Amino acid sequence: KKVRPRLIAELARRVRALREQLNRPRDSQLYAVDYETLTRPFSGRRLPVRAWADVRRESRLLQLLGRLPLFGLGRLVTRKSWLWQHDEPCYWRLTRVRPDYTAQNLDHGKAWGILTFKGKTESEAREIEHVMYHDWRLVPKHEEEAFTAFTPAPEDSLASVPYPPLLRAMIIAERQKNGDTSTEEPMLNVQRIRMEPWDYPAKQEDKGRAKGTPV
Amino acid sequence: ATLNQMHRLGPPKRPPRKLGPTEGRPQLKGVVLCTFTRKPKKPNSANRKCCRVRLSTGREAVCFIPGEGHTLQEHQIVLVEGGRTQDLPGVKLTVVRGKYDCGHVQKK
Amino acid sequence: ELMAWNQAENRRLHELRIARLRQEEREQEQRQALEQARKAEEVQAWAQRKE
Amino acid sequence: VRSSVHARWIVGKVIGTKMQKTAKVRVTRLVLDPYLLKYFNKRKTYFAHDALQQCTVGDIVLLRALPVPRAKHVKHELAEIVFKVGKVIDPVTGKPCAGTTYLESPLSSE
Amino acid sequence: LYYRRAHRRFVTKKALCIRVFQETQKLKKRRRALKAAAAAQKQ
Amino acid sequence: PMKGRFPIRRTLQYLSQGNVVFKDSVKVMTVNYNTHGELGEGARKFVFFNIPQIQYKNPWVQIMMFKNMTPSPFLRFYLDSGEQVLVDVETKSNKEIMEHIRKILGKNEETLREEEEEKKQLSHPANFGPRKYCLRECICEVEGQVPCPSLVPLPKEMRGKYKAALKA
RNA sequence: ACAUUUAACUAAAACCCCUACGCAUUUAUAUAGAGGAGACAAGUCGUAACAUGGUAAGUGUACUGGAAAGUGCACUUGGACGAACC
RNA sequence: CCCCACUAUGCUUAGCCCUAAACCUCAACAGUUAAAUCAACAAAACUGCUCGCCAGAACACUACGAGCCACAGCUUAAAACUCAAAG
RNA sequence: AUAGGUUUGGUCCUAGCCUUUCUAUUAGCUCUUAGUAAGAUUACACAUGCAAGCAUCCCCGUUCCAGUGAGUUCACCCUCUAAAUCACCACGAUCAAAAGGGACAAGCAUCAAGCACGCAGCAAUGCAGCUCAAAACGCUUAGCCUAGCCACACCCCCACGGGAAACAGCAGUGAUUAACCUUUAGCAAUAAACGAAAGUUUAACUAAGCUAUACUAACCCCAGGGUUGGUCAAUUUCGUGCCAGCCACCGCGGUCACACG
Ligand SMILES: NC(=O)c1ccc[n+]([C@@H]2O[C@H](COP(=O)([O-])OP(=O)(O)OC[C@H]3O[C@@H](n4cnc5c(N)ncnc54)[C@H](O)[C@@H]3O)[C@@H](O)[C@H]2O)c1
Ligand code: FES
Ligand SMILES: [K+]
Ligand SMILES: [K+]
Ligand SMILES: [K+]
Ligand SMILES: [K+]
Ligand SMILES: [K+]
Ligand SMILES: [K+]
Ligand SMILES: [K+]
Ligand SMILES: [K+]
Ligand SMILES: [K+]
Ligand SMILES: [K+]
Ligand SMILES: [K+]
Ligand SMILES: [Mg+2]
Ligand SMILES: [Mg+2]
Ligand SMILES: [Mg+2]
Ligand SMILES: [Mg+2]
Ligand SMILES: [Mg+2]
Ligand SMILES: [Mg+2]
Ligand SMILES: [Mg+2]
Ligand SMILES: [Mg+2]
Ligand SMILES: [Mg+2]
Ligand SMILES: [Mg+2]
Ligand SMILES: [Mg+2]
Ligand SMILES: [Mg+2]
Ligand SMILES: [Mg+2]
Ligand SMILES: [Mg+2]
Ligand SMILES: [Mg+2]
Ligand SMILES: [Mg+2]
Ligand SMILES: [Mg+2]
Ligand SMILES: [Mg+2]
Ligand SMILES: [Mg+2]
Ligand SMILES: [Mg+2]
Ligand SMILES: [Mg+2]
Ligand SMILES: [Mg+2]
Ligand SMILES: [Mg+2]
Ligand SMILES: [Mg+2]
Ligand SMILES: [Mg+2]
C-alpha cells in the first residue's frame, strides 16, 4: 500500500508553475493584432468575422487613457456596443489603472472602475473586462452632464406567471387530496428572478488568461 | 481431514495445466529440415513417414506426415497441428494436408 | 426502559443464586463434618501404629 | 464525537507491553469460511495508548478509538481493563474469583 | 513467539544488521550538530 | 456425510434462521461461559448453536468468548455510547437466552420490515437495462411496440439503407 | 548548493542551481566437456528375483565384485518348520 | 555358497553421525457392541474429537536450493520427456 | 452426470486416461437470399488524408469523447474537506480529489526470516522496539469485482531534462502470427464544445460497405461435410498382404480385412 514517491513529477510541476510566472506573456504580446490579416500574431488565430469591422475603426481602452494625465482617473468611458444597443447611459468611472509598460505606446494594461449599466450605478468598484477590445470611447468633460442624464422609468413588471399545464394540475390535485378546498390559481413568483441583459459586464476577477505558448 | 485442517489448507490448488507440443495453439507453421521414416512400437510394424521441422516458436520437433505418399522436401513450409501418432512414441505433431507446400493426397 | 428491566431480571436471578448457595453450604458443612470425623480416626489409628 | 478510526470499540488480549505507554493488544473476530460455513477466529494486533502503563500481559482490555491517530500505529486508547490477569472480579456477584471458584463467598456480604 | 532454528547465515546477518543500525544512529546525530552549528552562525 | 456433530449448523438455511438483529448501538458481545456444570448447560448450548446465527445476522459486531474465567456464565454487551449491558445467563436455556437478548437489544419486526421495503424501491419496474438490474432490456420487448430488427425485419421504408435511396 | 532585494501622489517590478550508469547489479538462454533418465519386434555376458527359485527374501549400514550382485552386524515376515503322542 | 587363517568391527572411555521392514506397516484421547457386521485378505464392525499425512505409474530414498560436528553423508524435495496403465 | 470404454487367463476393489454434452478461435472441404449482432495475432514499425473548435476580440474548449491492456491490490466503505453544478453573496444540497482509518487477485515456503521495518516527549531527547508459518520479506503470472471500473498514452515508473521524432483516434499499409473488415457518407437523430441566441464544429455517433463467427426468418430452382469393429447411430464387393495405411480410447493390417484404399 506504500506508494512509491514520484519526485520528478513534483520537481517538473514546480518548475513549470515557476516558468509560467517568470516567462508569462504581457498584454502587449497577447492582445496584439495584425490589422491587414486581422490575426493575433501571438497565436496566429483569426478574429471572428463580426469583429473585423470594429477592430479597424474603434480604439482600445488604454489607447485612450495613455493620452490622459493620470491615465484618465475619475473619467467616464463608454463602449460602442453599448451605445448602439442601449439608449440609457452605460459607462465606467475609472478608479485605478495598471498600464502595461512593455507596450511601445502604453496602449495595453488593466483598469478598475465603477459600473453604471443602463443608469443603475453599482455600489462598489470592480475590475473592467474587455479592456483589450476595440470598442471603447472617451466621454468629453463638457459632455459629461448631458451624457449622464437619466430618468428612471417605472419598474412596473410582471410579478407572477402561471405554472405550466401539467405542474398546475398536479398542485391542484394535492390540495384536494389533503382536503384544502380553495379556488385560487397557483402561480410562480418571478419577481425574485432579475433577468439581466446578455451583454452585462461580467466579473473580470474570475476570468482566466491566455497561456504562454507563442507562435 | 478435520474441519480445522480443511480451513487451514484451503481449497485444492488446481495443478497447472500443461501446454502440449503446440503450446496451447491450434496450428503452427514450420520449415522442413529432413524427411525420414520411423518404425512403430509393438505389436505394429511399418515405415511411417515423418519429418523434422523447425516450428515458428524456434523449437524443432518430429511431425508425422499423414496419407499415402508425400512430396515434402527440405526448406518447404508446412502447417502442423496436434494429435499424437499412437504407434510412434514421442511424435506429438501432425502435418496438415492441403496447406502451404503439403498437398492433398492423390486419389488412389 | 429495557435496560431497567434487564437490571431487574439480574437482581431477581441474584436472589435465586443466594438461596442456592446457602443450601449448598449446609450440605458442604455436613460432608465436611463426616470427612473430618473419618480423617481424625485415620490419623489416630495411624499415630498409634507409629507410637 | 466523530472519529476517523474504523474500529470504534474493540475488546482484546494484551500481548505486549514493551513500548512506553503503549500496550499491544490482540483482537479476534469470528469470520465465516465461505466453503465450510463455519466461523473461525481472525486475529488483528492493535496498539493502544496506556497513559498509566497499568496493562499487563494476558489481561483483557477494552479499547476506545481516539478521535485521530496519535501515532502511526496507535489509533486507540485503553478504555477499561475488563479482566485483570489473575485478579478477576465476578461481574455477576462482584466477588473475587480464581477460575471457577469464589475466593470470597457471595454470602459473606449477604 | 516463534520456534525456528537460528543457523549461521541468519546469526551472522542479524549481527551485522544490528551493527549497521548502531552505525546509522550515530550518523543521524552527527547530522544534528552540524545543522545546529550552521543555524547559530546565521544569528 | 457432512463432518462434525450437528452438521445442520453449517448450512445457510440454519444460519439465516436467527431472529436476533442487534440495534446499531451494540458493538461488542463477550460471552463468558463454563465448560462444565449443570447450571451452565444453556450457556454451553447457546455457544454451540446460537453464536453462529447471531454473527451471521450481525457481521460487524465483535463476538469474543472466554472459557472458565468466572464461576457462572454471563453475557456483556458494549454499546457505542459506552454503556455496558450485563446479562446473567445462569440456569437459562439457550432458547431463553436467545429470546432475552432479542427483547432488550434486538430490532423489532416493524423496524426490519421497513428496511426491507426501502430496498424494494431500489429496483424500479419501469426502468430498462441489463437483466442483472432491470426486468426488460429494451422497449422492443413490450408487445405493441416496434419489435427488434433482429427478430422481425423492419419495412424497407423505415430502414436508412432505402430511406436515402427513395430520396436519391 | 542556493538570496530579500527595488518600489510604494492608483500600485507593481524582480525571482529560473548542480550531482547517476558502470562490462557495475539481477535473472535467464546458448556449451568445450562430463553425466543421468525414459523409450525402443527379434545383439552380447552371466542367471540376481518369482517354487524352500535351487545359499528363504528384504530393510539400514559397511566393505568387496564385469554385470546382475556377494559378505559382515542388527532388524522385519511381506518365508517355511510338516502342527496329539512316537 | 563349503573349509582354514587373520584384520577393521563387535567391548571400555570421551566426542560425533541421526539411519532401519525404527512395522504390532493398524496415530493420541474418550466411548460403543446396537444394525446393513462386513468389497477381498488380514488382527470383527464403529462413534466423538484433535494433530500428522495422502490424491495414476514411473522419473525419484533423484536434480537444484537451504540447513546440519555430517564432505562417497543425512533431512526437506521437484520438473521435462514417457506410458494407459501401475497397484 | 442417469453415466460409459479401458488394467487381468478370469473375478472384485482402487485408480488414471479417454468417450458422450455445451461454447470460442484456427485449419481442410463446401456454401443460395434477407435482417440483426460481433469482428488485427502483436504496448512491433508506420506512407497519405482526416479526427477541435466556438465566438464582436476576452475567455471557454481542445484535461472530454474515442483507443489499448503494457504495468498492476490507486477502483469499495467510513472520516474529513478542496474544486465543480445549483444565475449571483448566500444557503445547504448534489457531485467528488488530496489526506486519515478499514477492506480487497492467483501460483510458489525449494521465498523463512525482514533489516529500522517502533514507541514516548512541547522540544531537547530517551527507550529498543516493530513485521512474520493465522505466511512477514520476496519471485512468478494476470487488467478487474463488467449499467461499468482501474491503469496507460513512443521509451527512461515520473518527464525539469534525455533517447529521439511516436495512428494503443478513424480509414489504410509494412513486418509478424494458426489468427487478415472500407484509405464509405452525413452532422438529419442523440451526445459533447462554444454562443445571449438563430446556429457552427465533431472519423463521438448515426446510416451504409466487407466477412458463415453467431442469432433470426426464408428458399420454385439449387447440399455439402463427417462417419459406418466396440464405446456409438450406420458397409456390399474388390485391391493390398504387419506392406501401403488407419485410430479420441481399446485396437486393425502376417493372403477370405464389416477397422486400410
Ligand atoms: N512456526 C512457528 O514458530 C509457529 C508459531 C506459532 C504457532 N505455530 C503453529 O505450529 C503449527 C505448524 O505450523 P506450520 O505448518 O507453519 O509449521 P511447519 O511444520 O511448516 O514448520 C515451520 C516452522 O514452524 C515450526 N513448527 C512446526 N510445528 C510447530 C508447532 N506445533 N509449534 C510451534 N512451531 C512449530 C518448525 O520448527 C519450523 O521452524 C500450526 O498449528 C501453527 O499454528 C507455529
Ligand atoms: S434490443 Fe430492443 S430493438 Fe433491439
Ligand atoms: K506383429
Ligand atoms: K499389429
Ligand atoms: K540370492
Ligand atoms: K523367497
Ligand atoms: K522411516
Ligand atoms: K513388522
Ligand atoms: K474408470
Ligand atoms: K470453417
Ligand atoms: K493489462
Ligand atoms: K508508463
Ligand atoms: K448532430
Ligand atoms: Mg489421430
Ligand atoms: Mg557437450
Ligand atoms: Mg537364481
Ligand atoms: Mg535365492
Ligand atoms: Mg541379506
Ligand atoms: Mg567377498
Ligand atoms: Mg580384532
Ligand atoms: Mg562387557
Ligand atoms: Mg523394532
Ligand atoms: Mg499424535
Ligand atoms: Mg535411505
Ligand atoms: Mg539425497
Ligand atoms: Mg545438494
Ligand atoms: Mg467550495
Ligand atoms: Mg482519496
Ligand atoms: Mg529447487
Ligand atoms: Mg509448512
Ligand atoms: Mg500483462
Ligand atoms: Mg505506436
Ligand atoms: Mg510516460
Ligand atoms: Mg486504426
Ligand atoms: Mg479472426
Ligand atoms: Mg455498421
Ligand atoms: Mg479380400
Ligand atoms: Mg475402409
PDB file of N, CA and C (backbone and C1' of nucleotides) and ligand atoms in Angstrom, chain I residues 26-30 212-213, ligand 10:
ATOM      1  P     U I  26     -10.654 -17.207 -36.545  1.00  0.00           P
ATOM      2  O5'   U I  26      -9.569 -18.233 -37.094  1.00  0.00           O
ATOM      3  C5'   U I  26      -8.216 -18.138 -36.680  1.00  0.00           C
ATOM      4  C4'   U I  26      -7.495 -19.455 -36.811  1.00  0.00           C
ATOM      5  C3'   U I  26      -7.790 -20.256 -38.065  1.00  0.00           C
ATOM      6  O3'   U I  26      -7.086 -19.795 -39.205  1.00  0.00           O
ATOM      7  C1'   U I  26      -7.894 -21.678 -36.191  1.00  0.00           C
ATOM      8  P     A I  27      -7.703 -20.013 -40.671  1.00  0.00           P
ATOM      9  O5'   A I  27      -7.483 -21.564 -40.954  1.00  0.00           O
ATOM     10  C5'   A I  27      -6.175 -22.108 -41.022  1.00  0.00           C
ATOM     11  C4'   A I  27      -6.199 -23.600 -41.232  1.00  0.00           C
ATOM     12  C3'   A I  27      -7.076 -24.104 -42.364  1.00  0.00           C
ATOM     13  O3'   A I  27      -6.471 -23.961 -43.636  1.00  0.00           O
ATOM     14  C1'   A I  27      -7.441 -25.423 -40.442  1.00  0.00           C
ATOM     15  P     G I  28      -7.375 -23.775 -44.950  1.00  0.00           P
ATOM     16  O5'   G I  28      -7.878 -25.249 -45.280  1.00  0.00           O
ATOM     17  C5'   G I  28      -6.953 -26.301 -45.507  1.00  0.00           C
ATOM     18  C4'   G I  28      -7.644 -27.635 -45.607  1.00  0.00           C
ATOM     19  C3'   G I  28      -8.812 -27.708 -46.577  1.00  0.00           C
ATOM     20  O3'   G I  28      -8.406 -27.884 -47.923  1.00  0.00           O
ATOM     21  C1'   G I  28      -9.443 -28.675 -44.521  1.00  0.00           C
ATOM     22  P     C I  29      -9.058 -26.989 -49.089  1.00  0.00           P
ATOM     23  O5'   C I  29     -10.490 -27.641 -49.325  1.00  0.00           O
ATOM     24  C5'   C I  29     -10.616 -28.971 -49.804  1.00  0.00           C
ATOM     25  C4'   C I  29     -11.998 -29.517 -49.559  1.00  0.00           C
ATOM     26  C3'   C I  29     -13.149 -28.694 -50.114  1.00  0.00           C
ATOM     27  O3'   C I  29     -13.368 -28.901 -51.498  1.00  0.00           O
ATOM     28  C1'   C I  29     -13.623 -29.281 -47.884  1.00  0.00           C
ATOM     29  P     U I  30     -13.898 -27.694 -52.419  1.00  0.00           P
ATOM     30  O5'   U I  30     -15.370 -27.416 -51.882  1.00  0.00           O
ATOM     31  C5'   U I  30     -16.401 -28.374 -52.071  1.00  0.00           C
ATOM     32  C4'   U I  30     -17.642 -28.032 -51.285  1.00  0.00           C
ATOM     33  C3'   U I  30     -18.288 -26.693 -51.592  1.00  0.00           C
ATOM     34  O3'   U I  30     -19.075 -26.705 -52.768  1.00  0.00           O
ATOM     35  C1'   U I  30     -18.143 -26.967 -49.259  1.00  0.00           C
ATOM     36  P     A I 212     -18.434 -15.090 -46.096  1.00  0.00           P
ATOM     37  O5'   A I 212     -19.129 -15.565 -44.745  1.00  0.00           O
ATOM     38  C5'   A I 212     -18.421 -16.356 -43.804  1.00  0.00           C
ATOM     39  C4'   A I 212     -19.319 -16.818 -42.687  1.00  0.00           C
ATOM     40  C3'   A I 212     -18.746 -17.900 -41.785  1.00  0.00           C
ATOM     41  O3'   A I 212     -17.917 -17.368 -40.766  1.00  0.00           O
ATOM     42  C1'   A I 212     -20.971 -18.456 -42.417  1.00  0.00           C
ATOM     43  P     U I 213     -16.400 -17.867 -40.594  1.00  0.00           P
ATOM     44  O5'   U I 213     -16.213 -17.968 -39.017  1.00  0.00           O
ATOM     45  C5'   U I 213     -17.036 -18.829 -38.246  1.00  0.00           C
ATOM     46  C4'   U I 213     -17.457 -18.187 -36.949  1.00  0.00           C
ATOM     47  C3'   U I 213     -18.949 -18.202 -36.660  1.00  0.00           C
ATOM     48  O3'   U I 213     -19.397 -19.441 -36.140  1.00  0.00           O
ATOM     49  C1'   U I 213     -18.101 -16.038 -36.265  1.00  0.00           C
TER      50        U I 213
HETATM   51  K     K J  10     -14.863 -23.297 -41.378  1.00  0.00           K
END
